[PDB]
Design an enzyme around this catalytic site. Structure first.
Site, mmCIF file in Angstrom:
data_model
loop_
_atom_site.group_PDB
_atom_site.id
_atom_site.type_symbol
_atom_site.label_atom_id
_atom_site.label_comp_id
_atom_site.label_asym_id
_atom_site.label_seq_id
_atom_site.Cartn_x
_atom_site.Cartn_y
_atom_site.Cartn_z
ATOM 1 N N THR A 49 -5.633 6.085 -2.777
ATOM 2 C CA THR A 49 -4.938 4.801 -2.895
ATOM 3 C C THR A 49 -4.814 4.312 -4.343
ATOM 4 O OG1 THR A 49 -6.992 3.580 -2.445
ATOM 5 C CG2 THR A 49 -5.506 3.997 -0.569
ATOM 6 N N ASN B 1 2.698 7.512 3.336
ATOM 7 C CA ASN B 1 3.477 6.508 4.070
ATOM 8 C C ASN B 1 4.918 6.927 4.290
ATOM 9 O OD1 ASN B 1 1.421 4.440 2.375
ATOM 10 N ND2 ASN B 1 1.708 4.023 4.544
ATOM 11 N N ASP C 17 3.999 1.725 8.225
ATOM 12 C CA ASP C 17 2.984 0.708 7.910
ATOM 13 C C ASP C 17 3.444 -0.577 7.190
ATOM 14 O OD1 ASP C 17 1.146 2.138 9.384
ATOM 15 O OD2 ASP C 17 0.062 2.954 7.635
ATOM 16 N N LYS D 52 2.477 4.677 -0.572
ATOM 17 C CA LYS D 52 2.031 5.956 -1.128
ATOM 18 C C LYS D 52 2.714 7.117 -0.395
ATOM 19 C CE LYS D 52 -2.197 5.030 1.447
ATOM 20 N NZ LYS D 52 -1.585 3.767 1.965
ATOM 21 N N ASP E 20 0.820 -1.229 0.000
ATOM 22 C CA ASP E 20 0.000 0.000 0.000
ATOM 23 C C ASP E 20 0.846 1.268 0.000
ATOM 24 O OD1 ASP E 20 -2.355 -1.622 0.231
ATOM 25 O OD2 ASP E 20 -2.119 -1.669 2.408
HETATM 26 C C1 LIG Z 1 0.351 15.255 8.691
HETATM 27 C C2 LIG Z 1 -0.176 13.858 9.042
HETATM 28 C C3 LIG Z 1 0.885 12.844 9.510
HETATM 29 O O1 LIG Z 1 2.072 13.166 9.583
HETATM 30 N N1 LIG Z 1 0.433 11.606 9.789
HETATM 31 C C4 LIG Z 1 -1.005 11.269 9.722
HETATM 32 C C5 LIG Z 1 -1.477 10.877 11.126
HETATM 33 C C6 LIG Z 1 -0.581 9.742 11.703
HETATM 34 C C7 LIG Z 1 0.934 10.110 11.678
HETATM 35 N N2 LIG Z 1 1.805 9.012 12.207
HETATM 36 N N3 LIG Z 1 1.622 7.793 12.165
HETATM 37 C C8 LIG Z 1 2.641 7.160 12.735
HETATM 38 C C9 LIG Z 1 2.603 5.815 12.845
HETATM 39 C C10 LIG Z 1 2.580 5.268 14.122
HETATM 40 C C11 LIG Z 1 2.488 3.889 14.321
HETATM 41 C C12 LIG Z 1 2.394 3.020 13.235
HETATM 42 O O2 LIG Z 1 2.259 1.678 13.505
HETATM 43 C C13 LIG Z 1 3.025 0.682 12.978
HETATM 44 C C14 LIG Z 1 2.532 -0.086 11.923
HETATM 45 C C15 LIG Z 1 3.300 -1.117 11.386
HETATM 46 C C16 LIG Z 1 4.558 -1.402 11.924
HETATM 47 C C17 LIG Z 1 5.045 -0.650 13.001
HETATM 48 C C18 LIG Z 1 4.276 0.390 13.536
HETATM 49 C C19 LIG Z 1 2.364 3.554 11.953
HETATM 50 C C20 LIG Z 1 2.458 4.946 11.755
HETATM 51 C C21 LIG Z 1 3.510 8.091 13.190
HETATM 52 C C22 LIG Z 1 4.700 8.097 13.836
HETATM 53 N N4 LIG Z 1 5.255 6.941 14.192
HETATM 54 N N5 LIG Z 1 5.331 9.242 14.136
HETATM 55 C C23 LIG Z 1 4.769 10.480 13.762
HETATM 56 N N6 LIG Z 1 3.538 10.462 13.091
HETATM 57 C C24 LIG Z 1 2.956 9.268 12.827
HETATM 58 C C25 LIG Z 1 1.361 10.556 10.279
#
Ligand SMILES: C=CC(=O)N1CCC[C@@H](n2nc(-c3ccc(Oc4ccccc4)cc3)c3c(N)ncnc32)C1
Length: 452
Positions: A171, A136, A152, A133, A131
């Site tokens: 997507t 991500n 992700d 993009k 997925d």
């Molecule tokens: C402008 C919108 C912006 O930036 N966004 C939109 C709102 C959410 C923001 N976001 N997300 C993560 C994050 C946290 C945990 C995670 O789990 C796992 C999934 C699979 C494997 C391991 C971990 C995935 C992503 C995240 C992060 N870690 N740090 C900062 N922002 C995060 C980014």
């Protein structure tokens, strides 16, 4: 067994990401800040068994690469999965790119190298993103040199992709044709990276259309051109790499690893003009995508609020066992806890302490349970409403205060809202045939499109 709320406390809600909401959390002993993705077992179907997921989690915890989000911990309760990892503060890549003076093939190559390097590493460990993009791709910090962290990796293997357009937004541009047909492997990530590279160098998706299904049709066909004027100012080696990455048959498609060695990555990450048109097109692209997104999220929050408002009124009415319309602080708390007990745990309300606190925030504003409900739900919707106003102001780059009917078509098309339905709604609002709406009109259009 360990409980997530025994160890962590919620600070801020960071936003909606794939499969769940993300919360800035803090360790209760050490004060270590972390970003937590919370996945609702209700809203998301698993594709694999528990044993296979646990095994993937264990591996992810051991993996380390500078371009891949680091996972620290994993928790599971009755209704949720909690994925705890490192917090990144530099936001999404494309948002940083639109706020730049110059952007060249050197900048794009440095970006793509990082993505490819992260992807290569994960493919060695038999993990496919599927997925991939722009959203991500997070930047590690606010610094100008800061590394890209891919988020992700490994989720789409264990969780079924949402069918709700609110979650599907944007997507379609990036999905490899063979993902659509069911037979896919790690090469699908090279395809998506090829689509991202194409956008980085031109500001336009290679496979485009007026709606989701129209984009998927073009992807399935696999045809695209470098006909757009801005491609004239782009090297032949860049276009060559794109061709190899956007190769239809996955077995004929270049690997992540071989893309790292390609002439283009070698030369431009080792006298180069600035792609001004591309920056202008990406800014338009991004604004369009974010307003469409804000619009759908705003409608959803409106529906969620209407649902919860009535349920909360029905809880406070049943609890009002003397019938006066007013309640005490402790009653409101037990009632609000009942709401989340029935409607499912909220992002900013991870435990009983979070609810107690939220009630007190509402009460500090109220200086009559009906007035509590009003402010409480208003606070629930605040972030979607201001995200809407901001994306509207972002899109309206000339500060004209208005959006044309042509711009609306593009916005609603990306939102996958039926063309005949929004035109109908536009007729009721724009009674003057201005061919444009201001923010309040735009907001009325959205209220009409969610049954209000
Ligand atoms: C402008 C919108 C912006 O930036 N966004 C939109 C709102 C959410 C923001 N976001 N997300 C993560 C994050 C946290 C945990 C995670 O789990 C796992 C999934 C699979 C494997 C391991 C971990 C995935 C992503 C995240 C992060 N870690 N740090 C900062 N922002 C995060 C980014």
């Amino acid at each position: 067994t360990a409980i997530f709320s025994d160890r962590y406390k919620g600070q801020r809600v960071l936003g909606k990401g794939s499969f769940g909401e993300v919360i800035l959390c803090k360790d209760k002993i050490t004060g270590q800040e972390c970003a937590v993705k919370v996945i609702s077992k209700r809203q998301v179907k698993q594709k694999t068994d528990k044993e296979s997921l646990l095994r993937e989690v264990q591996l992810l915890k051991q993996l380390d690469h500078p371009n891949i989000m680091k996972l620290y911990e994993f928790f599971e309760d009755k209704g949720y999965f909690y994925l705890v990892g490192e917090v990144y503060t530099g936001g999404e890549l494309f948002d940083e790119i639109i706020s730049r003076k110059r952007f060249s093939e050197v900048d794009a190559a440095r970006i793509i190298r990082q993505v490819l390097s992260g992807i290569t590493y994960m493919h060695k460990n038999k993990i496919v993103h599927r997925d991939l993009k722009p959203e991500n791709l997070l930047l590690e910090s606010k610094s100008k040199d800061a590394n890209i962290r891919i988020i992700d990796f490994g989720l789409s293997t264990h969780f079924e992709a949402s069918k709700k357009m609110k979650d599907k937004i944007g997507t379609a541009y990036y999905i490899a044709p063979e993902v659509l047909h069911g037979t896919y492997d790690e090469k699908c990530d090279v395809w998506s990276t090829g689509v991202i590279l194409y956008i980085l160098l031109s500001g336009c998706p290679p496979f485009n259309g007026a709606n989701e299904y129209d984009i998927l049709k073009k992807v399935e066909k696999g045809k695209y051109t470098f006909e757009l004027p801005q491609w004239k100012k782009v090297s032949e080696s860049a276009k060559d790499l794109i061709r190899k990455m956007l190769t239809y048959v996955p077995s004929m498609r270049i690997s992540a690893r071989d893309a790292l060695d390609h002439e283009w990555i070698q030369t431009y990450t080792k006298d180069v003009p600035s792609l001004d048109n591309a920056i202008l097109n990406i800014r338009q692209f991004q604004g369009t995508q974010k307003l469409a997104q804000a619009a759908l999220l705003y409608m959803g929050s409106k529906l969620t609020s209407q649902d919860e408002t009535k349920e909360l009124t029905a809880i406070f009415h049943k609890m009002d066992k003397n019938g006066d319309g007013q309640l005490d602080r402790a009653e409101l708390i037990e009632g609000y806890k009942e709401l989340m007990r029935m409607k499912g745990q909220d992002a900013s309300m991870l435990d009983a302490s979070a609810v107690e606190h939220e009630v007190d925030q509402v009460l500090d504003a109220v200086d009559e349970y009906s007035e509590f409900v009003t402010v409480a739900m208003d606070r629930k919707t605040l972030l979607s409403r201001e995200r809407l106003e901001r994306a509207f102001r972002m899109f309206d780059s000339d500060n004209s205060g208005k959006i044309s009917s042509t711009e609306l078509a593009t916005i609603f098309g990306v939102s996958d809202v039926d063309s005949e339905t929004w035109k109908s709604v536009l007729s009721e609002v724009d009674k003057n045939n201005d061919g444009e709406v201001d923010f309040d009109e735009f907001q009325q259009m959205l209220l009409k499109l969610c049954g209000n």
